[PDB]
Ligand binder design. Sequence first.
Ligand SMILES: NC(=O)c1ccc[n+]([C@@H]2O[C@H](COP(=O)([O-])OP(=O)(O)OC[C@H]3O[C@@H](n4cnc5c(N)ncnc54)[C@H](O)[C@@H]3O)[C@@H](O)[C@H]2O)c1
Lengths: 204, 196
Amino acid sequence: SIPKATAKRLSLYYRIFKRFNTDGIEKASSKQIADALGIDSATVRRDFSYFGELGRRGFGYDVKKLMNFFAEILNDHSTTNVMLVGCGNIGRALLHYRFHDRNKMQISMAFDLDSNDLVGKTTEDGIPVYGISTINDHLSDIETAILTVPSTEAQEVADILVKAGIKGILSFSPVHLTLPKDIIVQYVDLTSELQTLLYFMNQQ
Amino acid sequence: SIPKATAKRLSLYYRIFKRFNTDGIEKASSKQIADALGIDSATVRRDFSYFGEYDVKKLMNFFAEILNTTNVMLVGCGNIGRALLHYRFHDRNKMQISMAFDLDSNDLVGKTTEDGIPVYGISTINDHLIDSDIETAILTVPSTEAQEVADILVKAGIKGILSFSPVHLTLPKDIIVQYVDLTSELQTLLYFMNQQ
Ligand SMILES: NC(=O)c1ccc[n+]([C@@H]2O[C@H](COP(=O)([O-])OP(=O)(O)OC[C@H]3O[C@@H](n4cnc5c(N)ncnc54)[C@H](O)[C@@H]3O)[C@@H](O)[C@H]2O)c1
């Protein structure tokens, strides 16, 4: 039963193991993993204690097998249909992207405000685009949403989606949402990421 | 003297105290904050030890103070890249993309975006940098090119890279790299939903 903070690191560990794997490294020390990741080697070690037999020795981690252990935790769900809400910019890009088959996830419908051009039309990639008005009637097994609408619509729209039965939200809107307890929300705030980057550069 | 892990959370606290200060809220709890971010209520308390002091207007100033004239370079004008060239980063815009780069052979090179962002050929990055305040790069090239282009950025004197490729960049220890990896961000959402 992995701890939350450990789980947030899964995809970081996948990334670093992939690259070791690409470079021909069979075996890695927790020190090497820490140094590449820029975290405390003792954190690598408490994390890896949760990753079964492959991680239970503080050293000589098998790079091929753990790379795969990580990919397979992160793909351990059935095929998930996802809706996109906000076919603006950053949404325009996600709207066209087709996730690798292994990921067992796809954007199967898109939404924008009814004055938008794309409503009614359909993408050359295959995805129909409906008005945020048609949201409630247009649900289905979809539980998961990507949200890319402007700061000022964010909360309003998430509330529509939550009321419509959405349990998970990947939000790009740079505003903090307040939603029922049981609703999962994961944020990618671009401005906050640049601010963090810029703060570490300014530590010199 | 902030620890690395408290520092990662700084810009997350700023966005919450902005939100309280619009709702008109005067003070907030280690409780309220931990809830908002889905981190231990404790872990907040210990972060906040390093802030000397919870009044919202004051702390929203402390985080604005600590986080705040920044021009950014964008490298790789494809799907994502062209999306970010139209993306606004700030209210009173403290953060901007001033120029962009793609392969010299790309149709977009030698053009200026509708918002006045010039686009140059990657071969010229040294010229355009030996004069500029630019220390920061957003990297939006195919995964297969990300390392190699990151090596060119660092050579040209870039100190920070926000990368959108899901590929680990091995760069000198002084370079700060931050990842926005959209596929794995969605998998991570998926992971938490299937736990809860
Ligand atoms: N499109 C999405 O919704 C999305 C989703 C998940 C991951 N990503 C990742 O983000 C990255 C960007 O993705 P994308 O789909 O926009 O890529 P893309 O192929 O559409 O665009 C890449 C751009 O890089 C330019 N380029 C190639 N080599 C260069 C170099 N040497 N110097 C300067 N420019 C160069 C190309 O001409 C092109 O304009 C990729 O790693 C991709 O896997 C994107």
